[PDB]
Design a protein around this motif. Sequence first.
Motif, PDB file in Angstrom:
ATOM      1  N   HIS A 131      17.227 -22.617  21.495  1.00  0.00           N
ATOM      2  CA  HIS A 131      16.586 -23.055  23.022  1.00  0.00           C
ATOM      3  C   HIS A 131      17.536 -21.804  23.601  1.00  0.00           C
ATOM      4  CE1 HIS A 131      16.758 -25.000  27.337  1.00  0.00           C
ATOM      5  NE2 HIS A 131      17.770 -24.011  27.920  1.00  0.00           N
ATOM      6  N   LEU A 132      16.301 -20.444  24.480  1.00  0.00           N
ATOM      7  CA  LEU A 132      17.219 -19.301  24.294  1.00  0.00           C
ATOM      8  C   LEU A 132      16.991 -19.231  26.301  1.00  0.00           C
ATOM      9  CD1 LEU A 132      15.575 -16.881  22.710  1.00  0.00           C
ATOM     10  CD2 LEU A 132      17.664 -17.578  22.389  1.00  0.00           C
ATOM     11  N   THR A 133      18.087 -18.696  26.978  1.00  0.00           N
ATOM     12  CA  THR A 133      18.136 -18.393  28.240  1.00  0.00           C
ATOM     13  C   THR A 133      16.837 -17.714  29.115  1.00  0.00           C
ATOM     14  OG1 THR A 133      19.502 -17.068  29.064  1.00  0.00           O
ATOM     15  CG2 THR A 133      20.479 -18.437  28.406  1.00  0.00           C
ATOM     16  N   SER A 134      16.529 -17.667  30.415  1.00  0.00           N
ATOM     17  CA  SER A 134      15.480 -16.755  30.305  1.00  0.00           C
ATOM     18  C   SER A 134      15.883 -15.299  30.469  1.00  0.00           C
ATOM     19  CB  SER A 134      15.035 -17.063  31.544  1.00  0.00           C
ATOM     20  OG  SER A 134      15.801 -16.694  33.407  1.00  0.00           O
ATOM     21  N   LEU A 170      10.127 -14.403  32.130  1.00  0.00           N
ATOM     22  CA  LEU A 170      10.711 -16.157  32.177  1.00  0.00           C
ATOM     23  C   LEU A 170      11.383 -16.600  33.390  1.00  0.00           C
ATOM     24  CD1 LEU A 170       8.498 -16.912  29.910  1.00  0.00           C
ATOM     25  CD2 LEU A 170      10.495 -17.803  28.959  1.00  0.00           C
ATOM     26  N   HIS A 171      11.335 -17.566  33.946  1.00  0.00           N
ATOM     27  CA  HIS A 171      12.311 -17.871  35.642  1.00  0.00           C
ATOM     28  C   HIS A 171      12.197 -19.442  34.843  1.00  0.00           C
ATOM     29  CE1 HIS A 171      10.580 -14.626  37.587  1.00  0.00           C
ATOM     30  NE2 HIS A 171       9.277 -15.291  37.220  1.00  0.00           N
ATOM     31  N   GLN A 172      11.272 -19.631  33.676  1.00  0.00           N
ATOM     32  CA  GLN A 172      12.689 -21.245  32.762  1.00  0.00           C
ATOM     33  C   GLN A 172      12.963 -20.762  31.587  1.00  0.00           C
ATOM     34  OE1 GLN A 172      10.046 -25.080  34.954  1.00  0.00           O
ATOM     35  NE2 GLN A 172       8.778 -23.261  34.086  1.00  0.00           N
ATOM     36  N   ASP A 173      14.053 -21.593  31.060  1.00  0.00           N
ATOM     37  CA  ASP A 173      14.186 -21.322  29.483  1.00  0.00           C
ATOM     38  C   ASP A 173      12.865 -21.967  28.648  1.00  0.00           C
ATOM     39  OD1 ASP A 173      16.668 -21.281  30.816  1.00  0.00           O
ATOM     40  OD2 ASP A 173      17.932 -22.935  30.147  1.00  0.00           O
TER      41      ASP A 173
END
Lengths: 346, 346
Positions: free
Chosen positions: B267-270, A262-265
């Motif tokens: 909500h998880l960061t990339s 992934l490059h977005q959250d």
Amino acid sequence: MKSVVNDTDGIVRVAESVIPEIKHQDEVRVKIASSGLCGSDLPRIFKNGAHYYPITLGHEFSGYIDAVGSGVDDLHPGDAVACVPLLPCFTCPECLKGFYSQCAKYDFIGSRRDGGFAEYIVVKRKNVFALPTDMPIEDGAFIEPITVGLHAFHLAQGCENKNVIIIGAGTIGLLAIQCAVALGAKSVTAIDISSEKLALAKSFGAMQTFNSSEMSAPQMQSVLRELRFNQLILETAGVPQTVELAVEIAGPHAQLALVGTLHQDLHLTSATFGKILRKELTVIGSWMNYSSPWPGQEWETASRLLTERKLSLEPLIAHRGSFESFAQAVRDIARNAMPGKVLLIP
Amino acid sequence: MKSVVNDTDGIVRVAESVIPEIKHQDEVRVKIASSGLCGSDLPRIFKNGAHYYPITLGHEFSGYIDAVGSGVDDLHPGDAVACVPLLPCFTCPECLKGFYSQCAKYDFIGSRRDGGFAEYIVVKRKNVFALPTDMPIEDGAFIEPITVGLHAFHLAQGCENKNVIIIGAGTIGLLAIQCAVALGAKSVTAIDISSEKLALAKSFGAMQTFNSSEMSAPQMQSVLRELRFNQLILETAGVPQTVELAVEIAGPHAQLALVGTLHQDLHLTSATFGKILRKELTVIGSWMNYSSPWPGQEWETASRLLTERKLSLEPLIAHRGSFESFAQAVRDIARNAMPGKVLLIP
Ligand SMILES: [Zn+2]
Ligand SMILES: [Zn+2]
Ligand SMILES: [Zn+2]
Ligand SMILES: [Zn+2]
Ligand SMILES: [Zn+2]
């Protein structure tokens, strides 16, 4: 020897340099027969990132051994080989358990190092995988991207008799579909936003296809009801929506292989996260494409599939040609939404 | 007979009723000896929670068979039993495959129907589990919460020889620490924000503890370096911070068992997501506490561990008493949560 090498973004076309020599006892020189351009190696292409510009990328290739170091005794000049681009240290605790992809002091041809957009390259013996003499040598450029899909199947303990669902109809996803079919999947489903890519997926053996820009997850799950058991889902698209999608459509106790970075959250609602638990999903992180003994069964399998002609690679090929017709590479269909693989064929 | 009745808006009351009669051929009447309060009930009391009102909660109890219906062959008045509060339909495709927790037409005692805060209760034969006659009957009320941790172990194919990490030191997590020690984990590590709960965890055999209000994930991962292989991590806290924490500290190819339900979005960061892949984690959704044959290996194991006396329950018990020291004790939660388990004894 001719080459295709870049630097700080915007430049290329073809270069000219001296043939590399073996400088260590365990190196081989490979005369490259086919070398392909990947989406991983892409956005260093102009999306920058320090790195030393200097030198260029290219980790998907095959050719024939031209010379071997004094310490190499299991390979001879003229042996067909494919590139194994990762170089783990082989001695750390992770490496000794076959966790090569979790090696802390890794190395990578065409990234850390440099790889093969030249007539010749010198690499470590460990970075080449011997090919059957009956394998068409130019299809060797596809082995590395094939093993990406195979390594996810391996982590899920196989795709045989499972209802495979491939999310993302890019090269990796399309190869996974063909592999799943060739390897005895009960069924294969492909999901993507492009109807043309889904048509391609169906021609590759995906018995049904969902257009995620037209169908909702509920509608998909409804259609999947007959096939909701023993699912193996591959997320190849590497976008938050499709990770979310995978969880929402998944059947009871589905295996969910994450291959796309992934490059977005990722935002999972309480509801969606709750479905991971309620459906008792197994979510499997997948990284690169190796296992033990090095480089792994994935490489044997890909090799076998390619020699016994189980895969269709022509539709995945956007270009074939020698240096002049590949110094081409870059034109301006922009830097991506790539048709398919671009091959250098010296 | 007395009971604990919950109405809307935190209302708790002790009520009088008639002793329930057997009304179907497959029912049994249980004389209730011990009945405990769960953390998932806390939302059904003070925060709407329950799917109807007024309601009698209570799915964590044991007792003795008082009467059985005309269709019950294998139980007799006097038999010790524990409540098995889920009632799957046993005929749908999921149920036929052992996926009881994925049955879509479930009943649940103390949720969908009234529970065992009461002197007697009538339930289906399928809703009781025969207990060894030499198990202390009061400890029967702990079987259902023990099976939660055991189910997670089961989904991970065992905790044996693994380095298990329990995140969250609540009653579920504390029991999971004890079970892991009893079942032969290589090591047990506990993680929580409370130094007192961690001291309690250590006394249960967690041979090291991390306070997550003092130590960061990198600090913990560094201490865990020697134990980084074959980890089985249980997330029991059910908050996003601890799901994120589990991914950040995890060693290569760790199993991560998701036991706690979220009531917040995740909500998880990339980057955190990337670690699932890079570490090739396996994330296991856990739901309820059953498997085949009904109610599952978990129940048999909880029962053995208690009859063998391998578990220490008294420091888990916050309150004993009859129907209104019980009622007021529940009322005293209101604000926050449990110091430990609250039990009704007749
Ligand atoms: Zn790549
Ligand atoms: Zn290593
Ligand atoms: Zn968000
Ligand atoms: Zn409960
Ligand atoms: Zn059912």
